[PDB]
């Protein structure tokens, strides 16, 4: 009975976490892409200015 009761809370927490984990991955990838694209444009402009 203790094991069966503990499974109900665990399954309910594990179900909610799966939806959050998928959202967190998408949000981290978007931020990482935007930061990488902005740093590339800044580095390219700086390198061209420094050479000139």
């Amino acid at each position: 009975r203790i094991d069966s009761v503990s499974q109900l809370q665990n399954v309910a927490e594990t179900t909610k976490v799966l939806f959050d984990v998928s959202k967190e991955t998408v949000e981290l990838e978007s931020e990482a892409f935007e930061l990488k694209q902005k740093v590339e444009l800044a580095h390219e402009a700086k390198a061209v200015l420094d050479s000139w």
Partner: protein
Amino acid sequence: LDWAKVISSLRITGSTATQLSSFKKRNDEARRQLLELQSQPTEVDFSHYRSVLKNTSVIDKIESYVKQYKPVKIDASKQLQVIESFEKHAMTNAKETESLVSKELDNIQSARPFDELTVDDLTKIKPEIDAKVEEMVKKGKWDVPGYKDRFGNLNVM
């Protein structure tokens, strides 16, 4: 943030060890990438680049387009694979406990007259006893298997 409860949240089966390890590694990697990267756009020093460049009106034009908008590798919340599965998982694993665990001290609630329980009462509650004794007599086994070890036979010799 369940640390010790998320390692033992599964049943007796070791099949969910691969799925739990993959989910933890993905969450840690995503959090680390956001903290290692800068939480801002870009500096874009146009003040020192427009006057240092050889060709006229080239830094000024690049600066203006990089500070507007551009594409990024992102998605939308249309492909809700994990959200649709969450309802189904709760409805088969978490809802099963509401009728299995809930159905499972009635033994002590019914009191115990073992010093005065009748063999007719056991025959009435169990016809299996009567059938086992009847077939055990018909085949001829007057022995009782496993009686002598816990109960002394008290033969003279």
